[PDB]
Symmetry: D2
Subunit: 288 residues, 4 copies
């Protein structure tokens, strides 16, 4: 009811047991070491909460709905902001010298990784055991986003036929440029965009995570980002990329901390790679 | 054993959404809870550091180079944590006021720990965040025991070199400032008749009045009792000495301490300001200096040309 | 070519230390120069973005969604640049007081030291107070505030004939206040009950004062508010319906205007702080948008859409 | 006075020529692109100013005079703060969409040399190790011939009081304490001990150091490394507080410049190797602290 009965501070604020103190030689900085990681864990729980809620919204199948889409983008943004905070939080442990850590590491143990972070990685998902396993079997954010991308309106060959026209369009462009560098190299690539074999194979090699159709949808959102009906979807893509990056920045920081104290596989990678397939503006079919 | 080690069975089983318990789960309540729990963890950390620093002072031996180094490093740490706590407002900013009021069915904001913190520093009563509800004992100790302000004051008062039959810093300073002011006036008088001059003379009179006012003990006593200053006159002299001789080996680290204190004051103000804003944004219609170390902030006011500063030995 | 494209022959030959010119080189003067040159580059950028936005508004057709996007994105950009200019203050902090005093005199006189571009910026926003012509134009042409006002005044839904947002809102607020009063007076006498009565009294007042055109007229005349009553209704409509798809972007715009006001005011504050430290001797334009939060009502009191 | 004149704004604020505009198709975001890089160049000039002053201070001797040493640390710190700002400045170009960029990408440079002269100069003076701009190149050459920051810091480190084998004999004592302590850990006890033994004892292999040095996997002279390790271990000591601050600054600069160099290319793709490594590696030779030689 009242803070911090409401916040259960009897739990939160009585969960700090210094090993060094327990083993007769209290070390001041160990407290900081505990608090930093407990804070990391709290935010990990919050991120899991937001992420799982988004996952359900997708799973419920009404994601395309503009209200639901807004909720999703909003919560993903929240996850990104939390992640920036966590990246910034390393500055705290930077104020601990490696010596003062040595005065204590010794009551420490090797197996020093977060379960919650593992769960997080799974659900995203990157390439108590019931929770871990459940996180491994249930649908990842990547899969759900892939599904959503696959169902992007405009891909219908008979309808908008985005993929066909684009392809013809690039071609006329390649031809038009050839007659009037060093060029072929972009070419090598633009045309390669239409090589299902290369995409599936690279998919098997793990250099891509999205299905071919999903990639087509993603590229459609990319190209029509300025159109009204695509603003928020593009925001979602941006958010996914950002969360990716930040998760990478965090691992990296995390490791640094351990060497200092001791003696791109990324999952929306396809989204990041969208830029390589950038084309002159007119090569894009009129949208109305 | 990262779990048992971090007692996550406590930390990660302290998230009870009231809205969910009373049948109408509101998603953002979880965020509200987590953010405040994180704040509380860091308040615990800051109180840990601050209490350790206070003890170091109280023991005497603060001046010993090792101990002073400890103190400065931990105060710096507190500063860093505070910067993080300020950035943490960006999280709750991602929460809309209506979704808040979806769950705001429970009882009014304030942390006991934050109150202990303000007391220890310690802020004056007009200005602390509202807190009215074992613990009370704690609180009482926090109001009686010596604050960081008092201890730092004690420390400043004993700044070696303030004694008249030694360096006689204060006497020398009054002399050099008076002389310099006198020289400055001569400097102006030599100029042609404007347009600048008046600019020059006006600033001269303002500076003269401020700088000389520094040597008026009774005025200081007056401002002190009115609460526009917090440090004793002698303590102020010490601070000013550290301020002026900061580059000298024996003053680099003390000056770091001063900078840290000002930083902590600034950040705590910033935090309190962000906090208050949230309540208002969250409450809306229903919502209805100040720096402990204000004197250190005002040190810059008594800045004088380098040559007026008494030479060292 | 880089240097040619960026005209570094100009940019990188514009650093003349007075202290050196007058025989006594002072190392920190260079930093003092560079920081301010960087400031002015960014002010030129901000003026570029801002003027393009003002022009889009002035033309009518702000509402066409592409144009609305141009405006929102560029105003956002201004917000980001201003965040950077605020963080840039950390640089000038690295410079000690004594040392600045080592070179200041070459600077005197201080009232000399103010940016034309920063005032152009303020004019065009606009704060309430050869180059003189540029300044004059900025004084005569329409400010971002007036244009935003015009746009808000034109919000769809305020028509008393149509949706009647304001009419509906008064009715819903009045009714809701009556009901809330009855809910409260029905409680066991208490501690809690007392608090709720007070909160009701203020809430009641703030909410009802919202419909007092004359108070708004009055506050306008004192400058304690800047927007017309009608524009204010518009802003409030955007505010209450912010979650709705068609109001997402307008609200983004409002948020950006608030940020720009905050950040700009912060830069102004910080800046003089330094002049104060170096010498030893609130948020302006869009206050109405800042005050939007005070008028929040319970979700069910908000008129349903059509 | 006047502010406008003092800053030479007549140059700074008339240096913005949009190529897209010059060629009849003005593109709005091109202006942002130009201003961002001009701001980068301004700060680079500041960094070169600070850096050259620090370098000179080292070269003029009397670096050890605490006054000048303070100057060096504060200015190196300043360079660090500037670089943090430059890192945040990428947020500005992040407000430029790949489409809008692509609208003006065609008008320049092309490149290849769309890189800063000043940034290369800075790399040289720091000591970054391994394309035509004519007037300049001699200037660059001069940056290649004059002493790098790395070299001066190396010299400074070699002179660290305590290394002398007369007088404190830091390195020998260190060897004694580590060897004995390693024997004692050997007896008081699986993999980590043999690993720690290998790295810690290899610390005393001058030839391995010269080898790694010739390969460029280390940059400091062996003796310089001894000085650095001494500063590292005795950091709490009065005469080492400021030196350690300097080491920290150098590492920070190395980190930030890396961060910057990385972002200037990650964005080039979005639109289209450590100098003080030894200081970073100091942590690897961390030891229990009983083992650190007692100090005077």
């Amino acid at each position: 009811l009242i803070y911090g009965n409401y916040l259960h501070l009897e739990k939160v604020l009585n969960a700090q047991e210094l090993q060094s103190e327990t083993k007769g030689n209290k070390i001041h900085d160990e407290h900081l070491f505990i608090i930093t990681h407990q804070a990391y864990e709290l935010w990990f729980k919050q991120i899991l909460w937001e992420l799982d809620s988004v996952r359900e919204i997708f799973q419920n199948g009404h994601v395309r709905d503009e209200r639901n889409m807004l909720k999703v983008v909003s919560r993903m943004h929240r996850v990104s902001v939390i992640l920036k905070l966590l990246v910034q939080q390393f500055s705290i442990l930077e104020t601990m010298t490696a010596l003062d850590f040595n005065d204590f590491r010794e009551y420490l143990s090797p197996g020093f990784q977060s379960l919650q972070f593992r769960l997080l990685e799974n659900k995203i998902g990157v390439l108590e055991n019931e929770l871990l396993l459940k996180s491994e079997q249930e649908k990842t954010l990547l899969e759900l986003v892939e599904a959503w991308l696959e169902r992007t309106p405009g891909l219908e060959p008979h309808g908008f036929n985005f993929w066909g026209k684009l392809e013809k369009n690039i071609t006329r462009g390649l031809e038009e440029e050839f007659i009037r560098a060093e060029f072929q190299k972009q070419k090598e690539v633009l045309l390669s965009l239409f090589d299902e074999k290369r995409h599936e194979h690279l998919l098997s090699k793990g250099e891509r995570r999205l299905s071919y159709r999903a990639l087509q949808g993603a590229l459609m959102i990319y190209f029509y980002r300025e159109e009204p009906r695509f603003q928020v979807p593009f925001q979602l893509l941006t958010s996914l990329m950002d969360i990716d990056s930040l998760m990478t920045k965090w691992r990296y920081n995390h490791v640094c901390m351990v060497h200092r104290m001791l003696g791109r596989y990324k999952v929306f990678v396809d989204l990041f790679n969208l830029s390589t397939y950038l084309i002159p503006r007119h090569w894009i079919p009129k949208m109305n």
